[PDB]
Design an enzyme around this catalytic site. Structure first.
Site, mmCIF file in Angstrom:
data_model
loop_
_atom_site.group_PDB
_atom_site.id
_atom_site.type_symbol
_atom_site.label_atom_id
_atom_site.label_comp_id
_atom_site.label_asym_id
_atom_site.label_seq_id
_atom_site.Cartn_x
_atom_site.Cartn_y
_atom_site.Cartn_z
ATOM 1 C CG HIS A 698 -2.133 -0.879 1.044
ATOM 2 N ND1 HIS A 698 -3.274 -0.733 1.800
ATOM 3 C CD2 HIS A 698 -2.372 -1.910 0.198
ATOM 4 C CE1 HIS A 698 -4.165 -1.635 1.429
ATOM 5 N NE2 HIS A 698 -3.641 -2.364 0.460
ATOM 6 C CB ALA A 720 -9.123 5.096 22.501
ATOM 7 C CB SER A 727 -2.803 -11.068 16.986
ATOM 8 O OG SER A 727 -3.406 -12.348 17.056
#
Ligand SMILES: CC(C)(COP(=O)(O)OP(=O)(O)OC[C@H]1O[C@@H](n2cnc3c(N)ncnc32)[C@H](O)[C@@H]1OP(=O)(O)O)[C@@H](O)C(=O)NCCC(=O)NCCSC(=O)C[C@@](O)(CC(=O)O)C(=O)O
Ligand SMILES: CC(=O)SCCNC(=O)CCNC(=O)[C@H](O)C(C)(C)COP(=O)(O)OP(=O)(O)OC[C@H]1O[C@@H](n2cnc3c(N)ncnc32)[C@H](O)[C@@H]1OP(=O)(O)O
Ligand SMILES: CC(=O)SCCNC(=O)CCNC(=O)[C@H](O)C(C)(C)COP(=O)(O)OP(=O)(O)OC[C@H]1O[C@@H](n2cnc3c(N)ncnc32)[C@H](O)[C@@H]1OP(=O)(O)O
Ligand SMILES: Nc1ncnc2c1ncn2[C@@H]1O[C@H](COP(=O)(O)OP(=O)(O)O)[C@@H](O)[C@H]1O
Ligand SMILES: O=C([O-])CC(=O)C(=O)O
Ligand SMILES: O=C([O-])CC(=O)C(=O)O
EC number: 2.3.3.8
Lengths: 1037, 92, 181
Positions: A698, A720, A727
Site C-alpha cells: 500500500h 481509548a 492480534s
C-alpha cells in the site's frame, strides 16, 4: 509511493531544473566514489578537485552522519584518500541497521560561518505543502516544527515571494532576504514540478558569491514516473541502509511498473527459510505480522504481494523469480512457501494459480531437492480450480503441497508451517435501494456482478443505469437481470450519459492511473453525482490531493483510489466488491446486518465480510477507502457516517501502519461524538520487528513518525476504550463477543432469514464444471486458432516456417491435412504461378475490371470476377482431370478413349490450343511438364494424356494438351502418386473440387492485380456501347 | 433440458426484430402473415414491415411499389446488367 | 459451391474483419509522416477516442509473444535494408506495453508497417508510388489472397466431413419484434 532518492541524484535534479534569479553555486560540481571504480579517471573527468578544498560523506541514504563521525570536513584530495580506506568498503552500524559503505560523495569545501546556517524543508501533507525555514539551521537546528517558521501552500495555490518574505523571513538577515526569497520560490517550483514529496536542505549556506546546498534529503513520488520521465531520466531509488539491492527486486519493480497491477517484492533475508505468495497488500501485511508473531521474523526471507488481478504471465514471472531466489542456498530445516491471500474480490485465482503451478513445474527439481514445503490458502473467483491445479501439481511434482480454501482462518497455515498447530456538503447515506450508478470503462464482468447482487437483493431496478466508454460509439450492451435479458446503454461521452440519466448519483470509475484524474474532474462538473468510486492504483499523490480538494469544494464523497469499492447489503455494491455471487450468498451479503466496517484494504474487506457473517448478524455497510497515502474519504469520514446512521449497531475498523488517523477516532470517542461500540485492529505490527524501513504494498503504509506505528495505535485504542484484539487471530472472537454482549441487552434484534432470489448458473461455468451437455454444431480439422501457437492441421506455424515450405506447403496442410514432399509443394506453387492471369479479355478479369471502374471495392471487384469461375470459364482443370481419370481407370486405351469421346459428341477437355500447336508449344505446358518429368516419381495419367495428345495431334496440329489439362492430369498424378494420399483420398479430393480451388486461388492474384491496375489508371465508369448490343425485344407485350 | 428447467444462463448472440419464424404462424415484425394478406398490402407493405417495422399507409406502400417498378431495369449497357450477362453467358 | 462459399466468406473482409492491415498501415504512415514522436502519436490517438490499429492481443503479451509477429519481424530485421516505420511502430509498441502488457504489435500492424517499409525502402518504388499503392488497398489484397487459402481449405474440410445444412439454434437468437406493426 514516496521513495527516497540519493543525495547525488537530488542535487543533480536541483542543479539542472531549478529556475532562480539567484546564482546557484557548484552546479553539477561533485564526484561519486565507489569501491568498484578506478581513481585516475575520477581525477581526469573532475579537474576541480585540485582547484579547491574537499569534503566527503557517504551517499547511502544515511542521516546523522556528522554525529556518528562519517563526514570528513576540510580534507584535501590526499586527506580524503587516506580517510576513505578505514571506512570505504567497511562495515558500519547506524541506529539498528548494519551495512557496508559502497557509495561516497566528494564535493568542494564551502567556507561558511554559523551565521548563515539555514534550514529549508518542504514536505507534502493532505491539505497542501508545508515549507519551513530556519535562520539558525544546521546541527543546532533543534526542534523544527516548534521553532522554525512554517507556512502552508494549498493545493493548486502558488507560493508568492511576498508571503515568503513576510511569514518565512522574519529573522533572516536583511541583506539576504530578497535573493533567498527568489531561491525559495524556485525551490517550490522545483518541488511541485518534479512531483517531490519531501525536500530538506540542511544546511543551506548563502554568501555574497551565491548559495550553496551542502546537503539535501529528498523523497519523490515514484508513481508519477509516467509524468516526470524526461526530467528524471534513469532515476534510481537506493534501498534503506543495511539492505542491498537485488536484480530480482528490479525485475519485479519493472513488472509492476509495466502494468496496472501491483507486484511488490522486497528481500529482507535471503538466508531465510520462509517465503510468501500473498495476494493483497493488507493480506501480505497481516501474513507477515503472523509470521513474526510466532518468532519467524529472523527466518522470514521476503515481503511480497501481487494485486490488481495479475495476468497468468505476470504471476508466472513473479513465482519463477521468487522460486529462483529461494533455490539458491540450502537449509537443514528445509524451506517453506506460503501462498496465502484473502478471499479475492476480482483477482482470478485460476489464472494466477496456473501461472504459479507453471513456475513450480519449471522449478520442480530444485524445489524437491530443497525439501520445500508449500502451504496454500486462497479464496475468491474460481478458487476451486486453483486449489485443484495446486493439488495436481503437488501430487505430480512430488512437492508436499497442502491446499485449503475459505474455511481456513488465513493464519492456520503460518502457524502449522513453522509447527504450532496440527495440519488438517457530503451526505450521510451514500447508497440506497434506488441508487443508480454510471460506470466509466468497459467492465462487463463487474457490471454483471453488480446486477446479480441487485437481483439477489430483491432490488426493483439494476444499480447500473449506463456505461461510459470513450473508444466506441453509443450503443446498448446486453446484460442479465436474473434470467431476463436487459440492455444497458453505453455512451462515448459523460455529457450524454448524464443527460439521459438524471437519476444517477454515483460514479464508479474504472479508468487507469493515467485517466482517473481527468475522468473524475470531468465528473465533478455534474452536480447529480454525489459519490465517486476510484479503482485505479498508482495515481500521483498531487493529483489525488487535487481530486480531494475539488470533491470537498463540491461536497462529493470520494471512495479513495486503489480500492475495490464498497458493499451495502440489500442496497448497492461497488464494482467487484464481495467477489462473485457465490461469495455474496456464502457471506449472506444480500441482506442487511448490524455491523459496519471500514478498512484500507479490499481483500481484507472481503475477509471482514466473511468474519462478520460467520460471527455476527451480518454486514450493514462496508467501505474500503484504499491503500493510497491520501484517501478520498478517511476513517473518520465513514465512522461519523455510521454513527449518524441508525441502522448500524457496531463499527469495525481495520487500520494499517502509518498515518495518524485512528487518533481522530480516539478523539471523537473522547468528546462523546462516537457512542456505538467500536472494534479496531491496526495491521502492520511486523514493522517494529524489522531492522529495516521496508515499504509495504500500500502506498500509505509507511510510518513517518514513531506515533504512526501499528502497535502504538492499537495501544492508544485500547486505552481509548476501543475493543482491540490481541492480534488479527482474535479479531473474530472479539467481534463475536461484542455482538453477543450487544444482542444480550436487546440492542440488536436479528431479522428473519428470508431466502434470496435464485440466479441461474452461467453456461460457461457449468461447462467448466462438466455439469451440462451441449453438442458442437461445427467441425474443423485444418486450423487450430486457440492455444499458445497457431496450428495448421496439426503443425505449429513456427515449425511450418522452420521446415522451409512456402505457399505450397501451407496449401497442402490447409487443403489436404498432409505433409506433402518438397516437389509436390513446389509444383503447387508453379500451378498457382501459371494460372495467375491470362489477360483482361477473359470473363472473370472483365467482370473484375467492370466492378473496379465503378469504384466499388477490392473485395467486391475480385468477388465479381471470381463468380464467373465455373463450367465454361475456369472449369477446364477439374473437367479435364475427371475425364482423364475416368478414362484411365476404365482401362480403355487412348485411341478407344478418343473414339468414345468422338462418338458421344463430346470434346476432350484440356485438349486444343488457339495458335500454339507444334514446334512452338505453350511455354506454360512445357515448364510444368519438364518439372513433372524431372521430379514426379510416377506419372501414369500424364503418359496416358500424352498418348491422347499424340492421337489428337495426328488429326490437326493445335489439338495439344492444354495448360488446364496438363495441370489436371499432373495434379491427379501428384495426389495418387505421392505417399501422402491413398487412392480413395485422392479420388475424393478430385471429386470435391480441389483443382477448382487451385485455379481460383491462382487467378485471384491476377484479378487483384487487375483491380489495382484499374484503380491506378483512374478509369471512369464503364458503359457498354449500344452499337455492340442487338435489341430483339418483341413488338408489344 | 437445463434451459427448459431454467437452471443455466447462456446469453443470446444474435438479435432480430423483423420476422418471427417460430410459432404457429409466420410473423412479419409483429404482424401475422394471414393478417398481412387480409389487410391487402402488397410488396410495399411487406417491405415496410420487414425494413422499418412500421405499418405504412396505403399510399406509402404503393409509392414503394412504384419505386421498385421504375428501377426494375435500365437496359443491358449498365455495369450491373453487363456483369450479370457476362456471368450468365458463362453458364454459371 | 467452392466459388460461392469462398466468395461468401471473402465478402466479410472489410473494416471490422480483415481491415486491420490497411488501417494500421495508414495510421502508422500518417503518424510517421506527420513528424510526431511515438508518445505524441499515442496521446493524440488517446484524446481522439481512437484505438491504435494493429496494437493489442488477446493472450500473448510478453515472454510469450505472437510467434507470428516474431518470425516476420526477424525476417524483416535480417533482410530489409531500412525499417523506419517498423522502428516507429516498435517504439509505439513499447509505449503501449508500458500501459498494459497485451498492447503489442499485432500481426496485422506488423505486416502493415513492414509492407509500407518494403514499398518505400526498396528501389522499385518512389514515395508517391508506395503511397498510392497503400491508398488503393494493396494490403487488403494481401490479406484477401492469404485468407482465400484458408477459406478454400475450410470449404474442402466441410465437404470432406459431409456436414449437413446448418440452422442456427433459436435459443441463441433474441427476438425483440414489436407488439404489432
Ligand atoms: C484500473 C483497471 C480496473 C482498468 O485498467 P486497465 O489497464 O486494466 O484497462 P484500460 O482502462 O483499457 O487501460 C489500458 C490503457 O491502454 C489503452 N489501450 C487499450 N487498447 C489499446 C489499443 N489497441 N491501442 C492503443 N491503446 C490501447 C487504453 O485506452 C488505456 O489507456 P489509458 O487510459 O491512458 O491508461 C485495472 O487496472 C485494475 O484492475 N486495477 C486494480 C486496482 C485496485 O483497485 N486494487 C484494490 C482492489 S483489491 C486487489 O486488487 C487485491 C486482491 O487480490 C485481494 C486478494 O486477492 O486478497 C483482489 O483482487 O481483491
Ligand atoms: C484453361 C485452358 O488452358 S483452355 C481450357 C481447356 N478447354 C478445353 O481444352 C476444351 C476443349 N478444347 C476446346 O474447347 C478448343 O479446342 C479450344 C477452345 C481450346 C481451341 O480454341 P479454338 O476453338 O481455336 O478457339 P480460340 O479460343 O482459339 O479462338 C479463335 C481465335 O480467336 C482469337 N482470340 C482469342 N481470344 C480473343 C479475344 N479476346 N479477342 C479477339 N480475338 C481473340 C485467338 O487468337 C484465336 O486465333 P485463331 O483465329 O488463330 O484461331
Ligand atoms: C488481424 C489481427 O492481427 S488483429 C487486428 C485487430 N485490430 C487492432 O489491432 C485494433 C486494436 N486492437 C484491438 O482492437 C484490441 O486491442 C484487440 C481486440 C486486438 C485485443 O483483444 P481483446 O479486446 O482482449 O478481445 P479478445 O479478442 O482478446 O477477446 C477476449 C477473449 O475472448 C477469447 N476468444 C476469442 N475468440 C473467441 C471465440 N471465437 N470463442 C470464444 N472465445 C474467444 C480470447 O481468448 C480472449 O481471451 P481473454 O478472455 O484472455 O481476453
Ligand atoms: N560543501 C561543504 N563545505 C563545507 N562544509 C560542509 C560541506 N558539506 C557538508 N559540510 C559539513 O557537514 C555538516 C553537515 O552534516 P550533514 O551531512 O548535514 O549531516 P546529516 O548527514 O545528519 O544530514 C556541516 O556542519 C558542514 O560543516
Ligand atoms: O488460359 C487459356 O488459354 C484460356 C483462358 O483464357 C483462361 O481461362 O484463363
Ligand atoms: O488474427 C487475429 O488475431 C485476428 C483474427 O481473428 C483474424 O482476423 O484473422
Amino acid at each position: 509511493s514516496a521513495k527516497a532518492i540519493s543525495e547525488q541524484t537530488g542535487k543533480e535534479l536541483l542543479y539542472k531544473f531549478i529556475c532562480t534569479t539567484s546564482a546557484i553555486q557548484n552546479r553539477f560540481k561533485y564526484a561519486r566514489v565507489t569501491p568498484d571504480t578506478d581513481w585516475a579517471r575520477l581525477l581526469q573527468d573532475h579537474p576541480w578537485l585540485l582547484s579547491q578544498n574537499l569534503v566527503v560523506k557517504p551517499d547511502q541514504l544515511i542521516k546523522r552522519r556528522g554525529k556518528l563521525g562519517l563526514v570528513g570536513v576540510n580534507l584535501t584530495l590526499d586527506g580524503v584518500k587516506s580517510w576513505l580506506k578505514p571506512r570505504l568498503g567497511q562495515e558500519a552500524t547506524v541506529g539498528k541497521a548494519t551495512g557496508f559503505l559502497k557509495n561516497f560523495l566528494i564535493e568542494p569545501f564551502v567556507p561558511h560561518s554559523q551565521a548563515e546556517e539555514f534550514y529549508v524543508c518542504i514536505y507534502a501533507t493532505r491539505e497542501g505543502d508545508y515549507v519551513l525555514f530556519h535562520h539558525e539551521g544546521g546541527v543546532d537546528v533543534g526542534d523544527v516544527d516548534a521553532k522554525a517558521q512554517k507556512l502552508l501552500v494549498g493545493v493548486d495555490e502558488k507560493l508568492n515571494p511576498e508571503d515568503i518574505k513576510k511569514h518565512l523571513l522574519v529573522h533572516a538577515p536583511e541583506d539576504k532576504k530578497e535573493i533567498l526569497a527568489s531561491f525559495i520560490s524556485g525551490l517550490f517550483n522545483f518541488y511541485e514540478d518534479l512531483y517531490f514529496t519531501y525536500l530538506e536542505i540542511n544546511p543551506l549556506v548563502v554568501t555574497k558569491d551565491g548559495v550553496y546546498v551542502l546537503d539535501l534529503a529528498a523523497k519523490v513520488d515514484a508513481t508519477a514516473d509516467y509524468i516526470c520521465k524526461v526530467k528524471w531520466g534513469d532515476i534510481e531509488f537506493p534501498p534503506p541502509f543495511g539492505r542491498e539491492a537485488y536484480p530480482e527486486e528490479a525485475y519485479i519493480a519493472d513488472l509492476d511498473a509495466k502494468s496496472g497491477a501491483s507486484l511488490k517484492l522486497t528481500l529482507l533475508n535471503p538466508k531465510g527459510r520462509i517465503w510468501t505468495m500473498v495476494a493483497g497488500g493488507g493480506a501480505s501485511v497481516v501474513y507477515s505480522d503472523t509470521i513474526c508473531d510466532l518468532g519467524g521474523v529472523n527466518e522470514l526471507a521476503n515481503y511480497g504481494e501481487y494485486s490488481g488481478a495479475p495476468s497468468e504471465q505476470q504471476t508466472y514471472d513473479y513465482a519463477k523469480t521468487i522460486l529462483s531466489l529461494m533455490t539458491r542456498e540450502k537449509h537443514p530445516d528445509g524451506k517453506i512457501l506460503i501462498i496465502g491471500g484473502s478471499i479475492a474480490n476480482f483477482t482470478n485465482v485460476a489464472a494466477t494459480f496456473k501461472g504459479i503451478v507453471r513456475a513450480i513445474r519449471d522449478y520442480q527439481g530444485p524445489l524437491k531437492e530443497h525439501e520445500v514445503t508449500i502451504f496454500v490458502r486462497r479464496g475468491g473467483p474460481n478458487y476451486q480450480e486453483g486449489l485443484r491445479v495446486m493439488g495436481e501439481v503437488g501430487k505430480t511434482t512430488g512437492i508436499p503441497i497442502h491446499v485449503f480454501g475459505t474455511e481456513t482462518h488465513m493464519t492456520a497455515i503460518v502457524g502449522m508451517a513453522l509447527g504450532h498447530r496440527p495440519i488438517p456538503g457530503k451526505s450521510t447515506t451514500l447508497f440506497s435501494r434506488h441508487t443508480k450508478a454510471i460506470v466509466w470503462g468497459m467492465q462487463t464482468r463487474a457490471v454483471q456482478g453488480m446486477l446479480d447482487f441487485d437481483y439477489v437483493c430483491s432490488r426493483d431496478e439494476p444499480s447500473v443505469a449506463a456505461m461510459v466508454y470513450p473508444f466506441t460509439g453509443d450503443h446498448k450492451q446486453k446484460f442479465y437481470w436474473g434470467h431476463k435479458e436487459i440492455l444497458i446503454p453505453v455512451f462515448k461521452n459523460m455529457a450524454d450519459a448524464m443527460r439521459k440519466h438524471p437519476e444517477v448519483d454515483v460514479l464508479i470509475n474504472f479508468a487507469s492511473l493515467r485517466s482517473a484524474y481527468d475522468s473524475t474532474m470531468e465528473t465533478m462538473n455534474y452536480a447529480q453525482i454525489r459519490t465517486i468510486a476510484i479503482i485505479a492504483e498508482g495515481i500521483p499523490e498531487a493529483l489525488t490531493r487535487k481530486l480531494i480538494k475539488k470533491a470537498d469544494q463540491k461536497g462529493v464523497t470520494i471512495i479513495g483510489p486503489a480500492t475495490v469499492g464498497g458493499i451495502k447489503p440489500g442496497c448497492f455494491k461497488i464494482g467487484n466488491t464481495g467477489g462473485m455471487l457465490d461469495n455474496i450468498l456464502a457471506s449472506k451479503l444480500y441482506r442487511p446486518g448490524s455491523v459496519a466496517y471500514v478498512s484500507r484494504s479490499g481483500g481484507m474487506s472481503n475477509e471482514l465480510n466473511n468474519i462478520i457473517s460467520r460471527t455476527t448478524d451480518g454486514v450493514y455497510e462496508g467501505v474500503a477507502i484504499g491503500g493510497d497515502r491520501y484517501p478520498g474519504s478517511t476513517f473518520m469520514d465513514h465512522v461519523l457516517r455510521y454513527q449518524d446512521t441508525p441502522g448500524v449497531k457496531m463499527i469495525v475498523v481495520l487500520g494499517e501502519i502509518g498515518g495518524t488517523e485512528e487518533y481522530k477516532i480516539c478523539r471523537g470517542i473522547k468528546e462523546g461524538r462516537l457512542t456505538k461500540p467500536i472494534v479496531c485492529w491496526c495491521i502492520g505490527t511486523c514493522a517494529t520487528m524489522f531492522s529495516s524501513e521496508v515499504q509495504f504494498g500500500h502506498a500509505g503504509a509507511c510510518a513517518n513518525q514513531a506515533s504512526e506505528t501499528a502497535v502504538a495505535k492499537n495501544q492508544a485504542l485500547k486505552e481509548a476504550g476501543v475493543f482491540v484484539p490481541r492480534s488479527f487471530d482474535e479479531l473474530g472472537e472479539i467481534i463475536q463477543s461484542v455482538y453477543e454482549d450487544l444482542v444480550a441487552n436487546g440492542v440488536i434484534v436479528p431479522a428473519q432469514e428470508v431466502p434470496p432470489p435464485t440466479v441461474p448458473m452461467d453456461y460457461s461455468w457449468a461447462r467448466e464444471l462438466g455439469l451440462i451437455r451441449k453438442p458442437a454444431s461445427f467441425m474443423t480439422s485444418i486450423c487450430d486458432e486457440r492455444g499458445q501457437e497457431l496450428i495448421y492441421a496439426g503443425m505449429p506455424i513456427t515449425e511450418v516456417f522452420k521446415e522451409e515450405m512456402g505457399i505450397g506447403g501451407v496449401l497442402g496442410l490447409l487443403w489436404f491435412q498432409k505433409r506433402l514432399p518438397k516437389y509436390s509443394c513446389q509444383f503447387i506453387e508453379m500451378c498457382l504461378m501459371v494460372t495467375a492471369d491470362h489477360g483482361p479479355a477473359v470473363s472473370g478479369a472483365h467482370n473484375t475490371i467492370i466492378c473496379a471502374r465503378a469504384g466499388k471495392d477490392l473485395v467486391s471487384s475480385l468477388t465479381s470476377g471470381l463468380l464467373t469461375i465455373g463450367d465454361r470459364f475456369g472449369g477446364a482443370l477439374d473437367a479435364a482431370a475427371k475425364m482423364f481419370s475416368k478414362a484411365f481407370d476404365s482401362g480403355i486405351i487412348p485411341m478407344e478413349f478418343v473414339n468414345k469421346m468422338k462418338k458421344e459428341g463430346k470434346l476432350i477437355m484440356g485438349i486444343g490450343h488457339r495458335v500454339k500447336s507444334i514446334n512452338n508449344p505453350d511455354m506454360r505446358v512445357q515448364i510444368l511438364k519438364d518439372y513433372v518429368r524431372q521430379h514426379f516419381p510416377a506419372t501414369p495419367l500424364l503418359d496416358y494424356a500424352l498418348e491422347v495428345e499424340k492421337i489428337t495431334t495426328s488429326k490437326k496440329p493445335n489439338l495439344i494438351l492444354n495448360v488446364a489439362g496438363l495441370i489436371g492430369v499432373a495434379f491427379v498424378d501428384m495426389l495418387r502418386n505421392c505417399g501422402s494420399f491413398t487412392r480413395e483420398e485422392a479420388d475424393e479430393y478430385i471429386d470435391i473440387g480441389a483443382l477448382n480451388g487451385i485455379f481460383v486461388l491462382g487467378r485471384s492474384m491476377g484479378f487483384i492485380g487487375h483491380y489495382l491496375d484499374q484503380k491506378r489508371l483512374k478509369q471512369g465508369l464503364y458503359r457498354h456501347p449500344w452499337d455492340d448490343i442487338s435489341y430483339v425485344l418483341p413488338e408489344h407485350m
